[PDB]
């Protein structure tokens, strides 16, 4: 039995924790996962204070080569806009990218703004002020969200840009996906971006969004999977899944990555990390779907296995898989 420690992204934390509990029950192996944000996960793996790091923002091939790291995707999730609007039920408000950007730029300040009313003809919107909530920590969810806004709102792209940390025009700061969930819950009129599981688990209302093709879509595991149907995984695991074309393609979708060292100084730990992720691919799909995360296609998991064999070795050059 081994004790493993991982750290990083809160985006997939609900599923990593579920897998860890089940894995211990079946095998006795212990996996301790710390949700400290993707930036923190990257610093930790490079500092070698953990067996594996986790980040929703992929590292470039050069940065991976420079640090002697290897990265692989685990699941596909989606970012949603959790809202606290009195009188509105979940899934009934619809927003488009342009308007969402104008809300985050501070251009739109009330829930009954003309720009929002026009997108929601049947709705009777309140003249409630909007309280914007964003991440206070270095975040892979912020990276995905800002990558999306830069595509749909030019003023956002030119003035604030994309990043795991940016100079937010307005808004209160919440720590982790759980921190944003807690804020929305306690602030009438609030809007905040979180990975879907956090909204669902906390019974938070969320909005629909207009797809890249121009149709309103609901956030569901299937619709996150739809956003990834045209990604060519054979070329690279670092796929951008925001604003993708296609029927029922959730616009703010993303996969997430695990980072491990190519030259394993503690081979026994390295071997056990791969066994845990292999077990998750083989048996953990049901748990991932229970939490509304879509699974990676079998072809992709096969590419990852082929890559483990070629890349992960001990100091004597022997493969650990």
Q: Which residues contact 3 (CB under 8 A, 6 or more apart)?
A: 29, 30, 32
How many domains are there within the chain? 2
317 and 192 inside one domain: no
Decide if 83 contacts 102 (C-beta within 8 A). Answer: no
Nearest to 221 by CA among 152, 288, 300, 126: 288
Q: Annotated binding residues, as ranges?
A: 9-11, 38, 56, 139-141
260 and 120 inside one domain: no
Provide the 8-state DSSP code for 252: B
84 and 185 inside one domain: yes
Write out the residue range of the structural domain in which residue 126 sits.
Answer: 78-229+240-253
Provide the 8-state DSSP code for 204: -
84 and 203 inside one domain: yes
14 and 2 inside one domain: yes
In 10 A of CB 188, how many CB atoms?
Answer: 12
Which CATH number goes with the domain that contains 25?
3.40.190.10
d(C-alpha 281, C-alpha 264), whole Å? 22
Among the candidates 253, 287, 303, a domain finishes at 253
d(C-alpha 102, C-alpha 106), whole Å? 6
Half-sphere exposure of 291 (CA within 13 A, CB side): 22
Residue 236 class from Cβ within 10 Å (0-12 exposed, 13-18 middle, 19+ buried)? exposed
Q: What are phi and psi of 46, to 5 degrees?
A: -65, -35
206 and 284 inside one domain: no
11 and 33 inside one domain: yes
Question: Experimental method for this entry?
Answer: X-ray
179 and 46 inside one domain: no
Q: DSSP string covering 40-70, please?
A: HHHHHHHHT-SSEEEESSPPPHHHHHHHTEE
Chain center to CA of 59: 15
172 and 213 inside one domain: yes
Nearest to 296 by CA among 211, 237, 209: 237
Half-sphere exposure of 151 (CA within 13 A, CB side): 17
Q: Annotated binding residues for phosphate, as ranges?
A: 9-11, 38, 56, 139-141
Decide if 131 contacts 189 (C-beta within 8 A). Answer: yes
Q: Sign of the C-alpha dihedral, residues 218, 223, 39, 60?
A: negative
105 and 214 inside one domain: yes
113 and 225 inside one domain: yes
Decide if 156 contacts 104 (C-beta within 8 A). Answer: yes
83 and 198 inside one domain: yes
Q: What are phi and psi of 205, to 5 degrees?
A: -80, 150
């Amino acid at each position: 039995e081994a004790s493993l420690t991982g750290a990083g992204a809160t985006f997939p934390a609900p599923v990593y924790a579920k897998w860890a509990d089940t894995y211990q029950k079946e095998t006795g192996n212990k996996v301790n996962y710390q949700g400290i944000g993707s930036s923190g996960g990257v610093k930790q793996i490079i500092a070698n204070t953990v067996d594996f790091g986790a980040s929703d923002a992929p590292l470039s091939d050069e940065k991976l080569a420079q640090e002697g790291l290897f990265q692989f995707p685990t699941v596909i999730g989606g970012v949603v806009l959790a809202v606290n609007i009195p009188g509105l039920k979940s899934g009934e408000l619809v927003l488009d990218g342009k308007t969402l950007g104008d809300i985050y730029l501070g251009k739109i300040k009330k829930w009954d703004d003309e720009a929002i009313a026009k997108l929601n003809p049947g709705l009777k919107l309140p003249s409630q002020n909007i309280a914007v909530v964003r991440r206070a920590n270095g975040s892979g969810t912020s990276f995905v969200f800002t990558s999306y806004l830069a595509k749909v709102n030019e003023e956002w792209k030119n003035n604030v840009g994309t990043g795991s940390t940016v100079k937010w025009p307005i808004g209160l700061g919440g720590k982790g996906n759980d921190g944003i969930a807690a804020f929305v819950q306690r602030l009438p009129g609030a809007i905040g971006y979180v990975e879907y599981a956090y909204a669902k688990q906390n019974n938070l209302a969320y909005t629909k969004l207009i797809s890249a093709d121009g149709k309103p879509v609901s956030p569901t595991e299937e619709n996150f999977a739809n956003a990834a149907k045209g990604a060519d995984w054979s070329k690279t695991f670092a796929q951008d899944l925001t604003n993708q074309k296609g029927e029922d393609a959730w616009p703010i979708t993303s996969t997430t990555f695990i980072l491990i060292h190519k030259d394993q100084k503690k081979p026994e730990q390295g071997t056990e990390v791969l066994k845990f992720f292999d077990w998750a691919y083989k048996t953990g799909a049901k748990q991932a779907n229970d939490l509304d995360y879509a699974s990676l296609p079998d072809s992709v998991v096969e590419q990852v296995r082929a890559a483990w064999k070629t890349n992960i070795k001990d100091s004597s050059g022997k493969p650990l898989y």
